[PDB]
């Protein structure tokens, strides 16, 4: 397997005091294996986390961005993030697709621009409960992935991490079973192998997210095509340490 990733999506949460305490916990956890840890604070907390986070296995990610600076009140651009030292971004999270109008073509454009600007990108894909029950999971996730792929060159895939998060698993407590997740990860990896390249597919990290916790992480990671996790609720807690260690 390629190098795993354990990514903490703090979403729209945190106070300075709670973040200081949690970062201390993460700093004091010695990670002995090869894993890339990622923490994605809210924009306003990025400087605090940059100042306090010292664990060498971690990088900081933004939770969203727009491609260019300019007259976009309220938004944060990729050049602005790069200038402050952030070169990872999560794009296309279900919450943004649902609440904030991010269509496949908007996500694909953002991913393309992030790659051109040198970011590592965690690009999120996943089906809704209605799509799953209609036996459309594969069609949906492959459509979302091919929309992204259409805007990328083969070289750019070195910067891409895919995160499969069934929408019905996000925040609900209803994690996908290892078999459910593995079926989708395998389908995605096969599509990448056939449509992009077998060398790309072998090195591509495909993360699972949606109700990962420290108790279910190891049995997800045991599956051959799962390369780590994008973690929401449990990444606000000290048991994120055990999620990291489940990628051994």
Coordinates of C-alpha atoms in Angstrom, one line a residue:
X1 CA 0.0 0.0 0.0
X2 CA 1.1 3.6 -0.5
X3 CA 1.7 5.9 2.4
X4 CA -1.5 6.2 4.4
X5 CA -3.1 9.5 5.4
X6 CA -5.0 10.2 8.6
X7 CA -6.8 13.5 8.1
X8 CA -8.7 15.5 10.7
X9 CA -11.5 17.7 9.3
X10 CA -12.4 19.9 12.2
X11 CA -15.2 21.4 10.2
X12 CA -16.7 24.6 11.7
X13 CA -15.6 23.9 15.2
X14 CA -13.1 24.9 17.8
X15 CA -12.1 27.6 20.3
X16 CA -8.6 28.8 20.9
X17 CA -8.6 27.0 24.3
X18 CA -9.9 23.7 22.9
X19 CA -7.6 23.8 20.0
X20 CA -4.5 24.5 22.2
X21 CA -5.4 21.5 24.3
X22 CA -6.0 19.1 21.4
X23 CA -2.9 20.2 19.5
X24 CA -0.9 19.5 22.7
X25 CA -2.4 16.0 22.7
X26 CA -1.4 15.5 19.1
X27 CA 2.1 16.8 19.8
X28 CA 2.7 14.4 22.6
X29 CA 1.6 11.4 20.6
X30 CA 4.7 9.8 19.1
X31 CA 4.0 8.3 15.7
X32 CA 6.4 5.6 14.8
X33 CA 5.2 4.5 11.3
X34 CA 5.1 6.2 7.9
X35 CA 1.8 8.1 7.8
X36 CA 0.9 11.6 6.7
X37 CA -1.3 13.2 9.2
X38 CA -3.4 16.2 8.2
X39 CA -5.3 18.7 10.3
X40 CA -7.8 21.0 8.7
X41 CA -8.8 23.8 11.1
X42 CA -11.1 26.6 10.2
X43 CA -9.5 29.4 8.3
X44 CA -9.2 31.7 11.4
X45 CA -7.5 29.0 13.4
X46 CA -4.8 28.2 10.8
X47 CA -2.3 30.6 12.3
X48 CA -2.8 29.3 15.8
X49 CA -2.4 25.7 14.7
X50 CA 0.7 26.7 12.7
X51 CA 2.2 28.2 15.8
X52 CA 1.4 25.3 18.1
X53 CA 1.5 22.1 16.1
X54 CA 5.0 20.5 16.2
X55 CA 4.5 16.9 15.5
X56 CA 6.5 16.2 12.4
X57 CA 4.0 13.9 10.9
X58 CA 1.4 16.6 10.4
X59 CA 0.6 19.1 7.8
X60 CA -2.1 21.7 7.9
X61 CA -4.9 21.8 5.3
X62 CA -7.6 24.3 4.5
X63 CA -11.2 23.0 4.4
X64 CA -12.0 24.9 1.2
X65 CA -10.7 27.6 -1.1
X66 CA -11.4 29.5 -4.2
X67 CA -8.9 29.5 -7.1
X68 CA -8.0 33.2 -7.4
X69 CA -7.8 36.3 -5.3
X70 CA -10.0 39.2 -6.1
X71 CA -13.5 40.6 -5.4
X72 CA -14.9 37.6 -3.6
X73 CA -16.0 38.9 -0.2
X74 CA -15.8 36.2 2.5
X75 CA -13.8 33.7 0.6
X76 CA -10.1 32.6 0.9
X77 CA -8.1 31.9 -2.2
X78 CA -5.4 29.4 -3.0
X79 CA -2.7 32.1 -3.5
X80 CA -3.5 33.5 -0.1
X81 CA -3.2 30.0 1.5
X82 CA 0.1 29.3 -0.2
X83 CA 1.5 32.6 1.0
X84 CA 0.6 31.7 4.6
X85 CA 2.2 28.3 4.2
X86 CA -0.8 26.1 3.6
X87 CA -0.4 23.8 0.6
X88 CA -3.1 21.2 1.3
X89 CA -6.8 21.7 0.7
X90 CA -9.9 19.7 1.0
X91 CA -12.2 20.2 -1.9
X92 CA -15.7 19.1 -2.7
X93 CA -16.7 18.0 0.7
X94 CA -20.3 16.8 0.8
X95 CA -21.3 19.7 3.0
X96 CA -20.2 22.1 0.4
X97 CA -21.8 20.2 -2.5
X98 CA -25.1 20.1 -0.5
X99 CA -25.3 23.5 1.3
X100 CA -23.0 25.8 -0.8
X101 CA -23.7 25.0 -4.4
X102 CA -20.6 23.1 -5.3
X103 CA -21.4 21.1 -8.4
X104 CA -19.1 18.5 -10.0
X105 CA -17.9 21.2 -12.4
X106 CA -17.2 23.6 -9.7
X107 CA -15.3 21.0 -7.7
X108 CA -13.4 19.8 -10.8
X109 CA -12.4 23.4 -11.5
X110 CA -11.2 24.0 -8.0
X111 CA -9.2 20.8 -8.0
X112 CA -7.6 21.6 -11.3
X113 CA -6.6 25.0 -10.1
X114 CA -5.3 23.7 -6.8
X115 CA -3.1 21.2 -8.6
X116 CA -1.8 23.9 -10.9
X117 CA -0.9 26.0 -7.8
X118 CA 1.0 23.1 -6.2
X119 CA -1.4 22.0 -3.6
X120 CA -2.0 18.5 -2.4
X121 CA -5.7 18.0 -2.7
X122 CA -8.1 15.8 -0.8
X123 CA -11.0 15.6 -3.2
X124 CA -14.2 14.2 -1.8
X125 CA -16.7 12.0 -3.6
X126 CA -19.6 9.9 -2.4
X127 CA -23.2 8.8 -3.0
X128 CA -26.4 9.7 -1.0
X129 CA -28.6 7.1 0.6
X130 CA -31.1 7.4 -2.2
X131 CA -28.4 6.8 -4.8
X132 CA -27.2 3.8 -2.9
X133 CA -30.7 2.3 -2.6
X134 CA -31.2 2.9 -6.3
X135 CA -28.0 0.8 -7.0
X136 CA -26.3 3.9 -8.4
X137 CA -23.3 4.1 -6.2
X138 CA -20.8 3.2 -8.9
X139 CA -22.3 5.4 -11.5
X140 CA -22.3 8.4 -9.0
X141 CA -18.8 8.0 -7.7
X142 CA -17.3 7.4 -11.1
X143 CA -19.1 10.4 -12.5
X144 CA -17.8 12.6 -9.7
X145 CA -14.3 11.2 -10.3
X146 CA -14.3 11.5 -14.0
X147 CA -15.5 15.1 -13.8
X148 CA -12.4 15.8 -11.8
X149 CA -10.2 13.7 -14.1
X150 CA -11.4 15.6 -17.1
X151 CA -9.6 18.8 -15.9
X152 CA -6.3 17.1 -14.8
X153 CA -3.2 15.9 -16.6
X154 CA -1.7 12.6 -15.6
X155 CA 1.1 14.3 -13.7
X156 CA -1.3 16.2 -11.5
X157 CA -2.6 12.9 -10.0
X158 CA 0.6 12.9 -7.9
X159 CA -1.0 15.7 -5.9
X160 CA -4.5 14.2 -5.6
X161 CA -5.9 12.1 -2.8
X162 CA -9.5 10.8 -3.2
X163 CA -11.8 10.6 -0.1
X164 CA -14.8 8.4 -0.5
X165 CA -17.4 9.5 2.0
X166 CA -20.9 8.0 1.6
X167 CA -23.1 10.9 2.5
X168 CA -25.2 8.7 4.7
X169 CA -22.2 7.9 6.8
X170 CA -21.1 11.5 7.5
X171 CA -21.8 12.5 11.0
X172 CA -24.6 9.9 11.4
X173 CA -22.8 7.1 13.3
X174 CA -23.6 4.7 10.5
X175 CA -20.2 3.8 9.2
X176 CA -19.8 1.9 6.1
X177 CA -18.8 -1.7 6.6
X178 CA -15.3 -2.6 5.5
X179 CA -16.8 -4.6 2.7
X180 CA -18.9 -1.7 1.5
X181 CA -16.0 0.7 1.6
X182 CA -13.6 -1.8 -0.1
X183 CA -16.0 -2.4 -2.9
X184 CA -16.1 1.3 -3.8
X185 CA -12.4 1.8 -3.3
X186 CA -11.6 -1.1 -5.6
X187 CA -13.9 0.2 -8.3
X188 CA -12.3 3.7 -8.1
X189 CA -8.8 2.3 -8.2
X190 CA -9.7 0.1 -11.2
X191 CA -11.2 3.1 -13.0
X192 CA -8.0 5.2 -12.3
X193 CA -5.9 2.3 -13.5
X194 CA -7.7 2.0 -16.8
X195 CA -8.4 5.6 -17.5
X196 CA -5.4 7.4 -16.1
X197 CA -2.6 4.8 -15.7
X198 CA -1.7 1.7 -13.7
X199 CA 1.3 3.6 -12.1
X200 CA -1.1 6.3 -11.0
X201 CA -3.5 3.8 -9.5
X202 CA -0.9 2.0 -7.6
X203 CA 0.3 5.1 -5.8
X204 CA -3.1 6.8 -5.3
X205 CA -4.4 7.2 -1.8
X206 CA -8.1 6.6 -1.5
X207 CA -9.3 7.5 2.0
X208 CA -12.6 6.5 3.6
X209 CA -14.6 8.8 5.7
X210 CA -17.9 8.8 7.4
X211 CA -18.2 8.0 11.1
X212 CA -14.7 6.6 11.4
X213 CA -13.8 6.2 15.1
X214 CA -10.9 4.6 16.9
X215 CA -12.7 1.3 17.3
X216 CA -13.7 0.8 13.6
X217 CA -10.6 2.3 12.0
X218 CA -8.4 -0.8 12.1
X219 CA -10.9 -3.1 10.5
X220 CA -11.4 -0.6 7.7
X221 CA -7.7 -0.1 7.2
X222 CA -7.2 -3.9 6.9
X223 CA -8.9 -3.8 3.5
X224 CA -6.5 -3.7 0.6
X225 CA -7.7 -0.5 -1.2
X226 CA -8.3 1.7 1.9
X227 CA -5.4 4.1 2.4
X228 CA -6.6 6.0 5.5
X229 CA -9.3 8.2 6.7
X230 CA -10.9 11.5 6.6
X231 CA -12.3 12.0 10.0
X232 CA -14.8 14.6 11.3
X233 CA -16.3 14.1 14.7
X234 CA -13.6 11.8 16.1
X235 CA -10.8 14.2 15.1
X236 CA -11.9 16.6 17.7
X237 CA -11.1 14.1 20.4
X238 CA -8.0 12.5 21.8
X239 CA -8.9 9.2 20.2
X240 CA -7.7 10.6 16.9
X241 CA -4.4 9.3 18.1
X242 CA -5.7 5.7 17.9
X243 CA -7.1 6.4 14.4
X244 CA -3.7 7.4 13.3
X245 CA -2.2 4.3 14.9
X246 CA -4.8 2.1 13.1
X247 CA -3.0 2.9 9.8
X248 CA 0.1 0.8 10.9

